[PDB]
Each structure stands twice: as C-alpha cells, then as structure tokens.
Amino acid sequence: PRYLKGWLEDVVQLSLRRPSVHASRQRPIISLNERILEFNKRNITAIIAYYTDPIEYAKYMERYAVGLSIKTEEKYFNGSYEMLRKIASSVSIPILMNDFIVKESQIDDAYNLGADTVLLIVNILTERELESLLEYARSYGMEPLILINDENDLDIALRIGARFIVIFSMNFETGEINKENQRKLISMIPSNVVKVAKLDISERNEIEELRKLGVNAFLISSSLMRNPEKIKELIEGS
Amino acid sequence: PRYLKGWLEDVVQLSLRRPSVHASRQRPIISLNERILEFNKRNITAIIAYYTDPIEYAKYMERYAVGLSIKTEEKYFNGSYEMLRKIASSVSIPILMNDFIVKESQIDDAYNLGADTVLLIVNILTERELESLLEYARSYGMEPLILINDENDLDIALRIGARFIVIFSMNFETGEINKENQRKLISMIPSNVVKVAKLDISERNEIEELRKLGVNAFLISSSLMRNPEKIKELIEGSH
Ligand SMILES: CCCCCCCCCCCC[N+](C)(C)CCCC(=O)O
Numbered sequence: 001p002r003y004l005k006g007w008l009e010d011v012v013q014l015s016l017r018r019p020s021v022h023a024s025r026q027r028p029i030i031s032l033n034e035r036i037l038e039f040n041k042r043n044i045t046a047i048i049a050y051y052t053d054p055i056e057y058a059k060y061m062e063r064y065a066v067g068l069s070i071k072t073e074e075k076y077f078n079g080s081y082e083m084l085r086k087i088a089s090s091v092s093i094p095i096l097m098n099d100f101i102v103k104e105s106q107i108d109d110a111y112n113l114g115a116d117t118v119l120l121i122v123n124i125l126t127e128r129e130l131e132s133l134l135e136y137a138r139s140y141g142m143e144p145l146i147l148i149n150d151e152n153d154l155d156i157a158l159r160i161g162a163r164f165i166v167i168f169s170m171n172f173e174t175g176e177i178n179k180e181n182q183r184k185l186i187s188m189i190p191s192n193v194v195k196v197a198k199l200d201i202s203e204r205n206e207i208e209e210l211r212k213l214g215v216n217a218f219l220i221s222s223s224l225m226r227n228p229e230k231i232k233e234l235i236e237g238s
Numbered sequence: 239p240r241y242l243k244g245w246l247e248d249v250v251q252l253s254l255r256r257p258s259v260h261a262s263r264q265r266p267i268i269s270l271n272e273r274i275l276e277f278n279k280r281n282i283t284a285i286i287a288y289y290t291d292p293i294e295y296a297k298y299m300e301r302y303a304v305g306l307s308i309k310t311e312e313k314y315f316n317g318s319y320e321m322l323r324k325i326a327s328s329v330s331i332p333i334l335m336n337d338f339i340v341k342e343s344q345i346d347d348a349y350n351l352g353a354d355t356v357l358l359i360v361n362i363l364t365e366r367e368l369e370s371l372l373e374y375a376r377s378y379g380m381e382p383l384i385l386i387n388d389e390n391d392l393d394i395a396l397r398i399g400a401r402f403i404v405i406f407s408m409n410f411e412t413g414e415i416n417k418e419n420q421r422k423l424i425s426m427i428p429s430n431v432v433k434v435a436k437l438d439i440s441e442r443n444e445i446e447e448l449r450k451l452g453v454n455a456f457l458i459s460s461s462l463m464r465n466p467e468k469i470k471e472l473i474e475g476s477h
C-alpha cells in the first residue's frame with residue numbers, strides 16, 4: 001500500500017496481517033450495484049444502511065435498504081468477521097464488506113463470509129494495487145465500491161476502469177465531509193458509473209438535490225442512533 | 239487559437255478576420271438546450287436539423303425539429319450571415335449558428351443575426367479562449383454547444399464547466415466518424431450534461447440505443463436528400 005502517517009498507517013500495517021478465515025458461503029452473490037440500478041428504474045430511493053445486536057438491525061433494514069454496509073475492521077471500528085458471516089447468512093439483500101482492504105486474502109474472506117462486494121480505498125493503495133484488487137474482486141463476481149476522496153483519487157479510479165464509486169471528500173483525521181468538494185467530484189464522474197454519495201443522517205434532506213446531480217444511491221451513517229425503526233422513520237419522513 | 243495545419247488552419251485564420259455585422263435581433267433567445275430537455279420530459283425525440291431553398295426547408299422542419307443548425311462559414315461550407323438572419327427571422331424554434339468561432343465579435347454576430355446559441359469547438363481554441371468565449375456567449379443568454387472530438391477535448395470542456403456538449407469523434411480531413419469512439423466519449427460524460435450526438439440519416443436506427451446510453455438530442459445530417467418531406471418521413475418511420 002501507500003506509506004501513510006498516524007492511525008491510517010497503523011490500520012494499514014494491521015490489515016496487512018489480517019489472518020484469512022476458513023468459511024464457505026450460504027447463497028450466491030447478489031449484485032449491489034445492479035440492485036441500485038433497478039431501484040433507480042423503479043424510482044425507489046436507494047440507501048445503503050451503514051451499520052456501526054447487529055442481526056436485529058440487519059433484519060429490520062432488509063425490507064427497506066438497497067444494501068447493508070458491515071464494518072469488519074477490528075481495532076478502530078469494533079468489527080469482526082463472525083459478525084459479517086452471521087449477518088450475511090440471515091439476510092438476502094447485498095452486503096458490502098467495509099474494511100481497509102490491502103491484500104487479496106481479504107477479498108477471499110469477504111467472499112467466503114457471504115459478502116456481495118467490498119470497499120476499496122484509492123487513497124491507501126498504489127494504482128497498480130487498486131487495479132489488481134479491483135480485478136481480483138471481479139474474479140469472484142464482485143464489483144467493489146471504490147472510495148474517492150479528491151480529484152487525484154478520481155483520476156486513478158477512472159483510469160483503472162472503476163464502475164462503482166462512493167464519494168466521500170472527508171478528512172480522515174476529523175471525519176467531516178467538505179460538501180462543496182463532494183459535489184464537485186460527483187459532477188466529474190461518468191454517467192455509466194454507479195455513483196454513491198456518503199451522508200450522515202442529519203444531512204438526509206440533501207438526498208433530492210443529490211439525485212438530480214446524478215447520484216444513484218446513498219451510503220447513510222446514522223450517527224449515535226440505535227433504533228432501526230427510528231432511523232428508518234427519520235429517513236422516510238424526509 | 240491553437241496552432242493547426244491544413245484547411246483547418248486556413249478556416250481559423252479566415253475566421254479571425256471575419257467582418258462583424260450590425261443587425262438588430264428581432265425576437266428574444268429561445269434556449270435550445272432547455273427545449274431539448276422539454277422534449278426529453280415529453281418523450282419526443284429531439285433532433286437538430288443540420289441543414290446542408292433553405293427558408294422552405296426551415297419552415298417545414300420548424301414543426302418537427304427541436305432546433306435548426308445553420309452554417310455560416312463561407313469558404314468551405316457555403317454558409318452566410320445573411321442566410322442565418324432570414325431563417326432566424328422566420329421560424330420560432332431555437333437556431334444554432336455553426337461556424338468556427340475564435341473571437342467574441344462572432345458571438346456578437348450570432349446574437350445580432352438572431353441565432354439562439356453558437357457552436358464552440360474545443361480543438362481549435364486554447365483553454366483560456368474557450369473558457370472566455372463560453373462566458374461571453376452566456377453574457378447574451380446563449381449556452382453554447384461545445385464540440386468534443388476526443389478524450390482530451392472532453393477533459394477540457396468538463397473542467398471549464400461545459401453544460402451542453404456535442405460528440406463528434408470525426409476525422410477532420412475526411413469527415414468520417416469513428417462510431418465506437420463516439421460511444422466511448424458519450425459514456426465518459428457526466429449525467430447532468432445535455433448530450434448531443436452527430437448522426438447521418440443512414441444511422442437513424444441507432445437513435446433508441448443512443449437514448450439508452452444517455453444522449454438527449456441528435457444533430458442529424460440528411461446527406462444528399464433534397465425533399466424535406468422524404469427526410470422527415472424517413473426519420474418518422476425509423477422510430
Ligand atoms: C470502512 C469505511 C471507510 C470509512 C473510514 C474513513 C476513515 C476516517 C474516519 C476517522 C477516523 C478517526 N479515528 C477514529 C481513527 C480517530 C483518529 C484521529 C486522528 O487522526 O488523530
């Protein structure tokens with residue numbers, strides 16, 4: 001990967017050592033990106049539920065969300081592989097594995113655990129690595145969601161042929177999104193790319209303008225909320 | 239302008255020396271790109287008639303075309319400023335003045351002759367010139383149609399904030415379009431740009447699939463045909 005600083009370098013160092021799992025999947029892959037496209041056709045707002053017990057939430061969100069985002073990074077985000085595997089086997093909507101993917105065995109894990117795609121982060125990989133890991137996931141039938149954070153990220157993402165892009169424009173220190181830069185990046189992205197905008201639930205009212213801007217789906221974090229129904233009702237009312 | 243070679247250099251040097259005109263516009267701007275979006279909303283195929291007796295042709299296509307393109311380049315395309323004024327004073331659908339625009343006075347000419355927008359061509363202009371002519375056209379209420387011919391063109395147009403793009407991908411000596419590169423370029427354009435594809439009338443069967451790729455309108459040349467009813471009926475049939 002890249003040679004970074006601080007906690008990002010630590011989580012990169014740790015992820016490079018992530019032991020792979022013995023596991024086998026319960027169902028075939030459900031394409032997250034194509035389901036988003038089918039939600040667009042049917043004029044249903046496509047929201048990836050960004051989860052931070054987890055089985056209860058996944059059960060509730062299954063009837064409403066276009067897909068589920070499950071954190072598996074262990075040191076800084078309290079995730080686990082077993083959590084993912086349990087969620088993936090008892091739900092039948094696409095599961096996105098959310099982690100710091102730096103080697104091919106992590107894509108094996110995601111696949112063997114029941115995930116339907118994985119997150120790739122341009123800003124921690126070389127261009128060579130990103131194309132190699134993008135093609136490795138596709139070998140399993142997984143179009144990964146590629147996280148872009150700035151213009152250079154997007155240049156690389158389009159050069160290697162990414163079809164599934166999530167736009168952050170976030171400071172990896174604080175965690176705040178520059179909405180202005182996010183809008184910019186979204187507007188530079190080809191229309192044959194499935195575009196996902198990262199939001200917090202407090203900015204839920206930006207959804208409609210972002211749709212008109214070309215956004216196909218939304219990766220929505222619910223901050224400190226714990227009640228799936230209340231999360232869902234707050235999304236619904238906007 | 240950029241440095242160029244062949245006939246393209248010649249027409250660009252001729253255009254730098256194009257005398258301006260002093261006419262008075264006889265009706266307000268009718269926005270071509272918005273009318274295109276109106277047609278999209280109504281599921282009416284939007285086609286810009288690429289005219290190539292012209293007043294009879296214009297009066298006839300006014301009922302069906304989303305807009306008209308009139309050539310005003312004089313030496314190679316047999317166009318004239320006076321033909322543009324007479325057509326524009328006679329139909330009520332948007333008019334596109336198609337020329338080699340390298341200076342602001344030509345945009346003045348378009349406005350004063352009654353055109354509703356202008357063509358700008360990425361590959362004959364520097365980036366600064368193109369951004370400058372873009373805003374000057376916008377000073378009159380003309381969102382120009384920006385012509386892109388390759389990926390470097392498209393990169394420059396999206397950076398300056400082109401909202402209205404026509405995709406050619408044409409060998410500028412022969413006039414032949416690389417069809418699969420035209421489709422590549424179409425798909426590289428963000429979804430919120432109004433997209434126009436150049437077509438020959440013999441390619442009218444590609445319209446539906448081009449709509450599916452995200453194309454909003456079609457700049458259709460009718461080749462050698464001389465009967466405007468036959469031209470319309472040939473397109474009417476293929477839908
Ligand atoms: C798998 C999902 C991708 C999103 C992860 C983005 C990372 C940015 C979030 C901020 C993380 C901040 N923490 C918790 C590590 C604190 C570190 C603060 C610091 O830089 O000093």
Ligand SMILES: CCCCCCCCCCCC[N+](C)(C)CCCC(=O)O
Pocket residue numbers: 281282283285286287288299302303439458459460469470473474477
């Ligand atoms: C090359 C010159 C192009 C002139 C534009 C001719 C368009 C022909 C359309 C004929 C109108 C037929 N209508 C009345 C049924 C409308 C068609 C509806 C549709 O767009 O499918």
Ligand SMILES: CCCCCCCCCCCC[N+](C)(C)CCCC(=O)O
Pocket residue numbers: 245309311314315336337338357408409410411412413
């Ligand atoms: C006229 C408004 C601009 C539209 C874009 C022009 C593209 C046309 C390209 C085809 C060029 C064909 N020609 C005949 C002009 C070249 C031959 C000139 C010559 O050597 O006689």
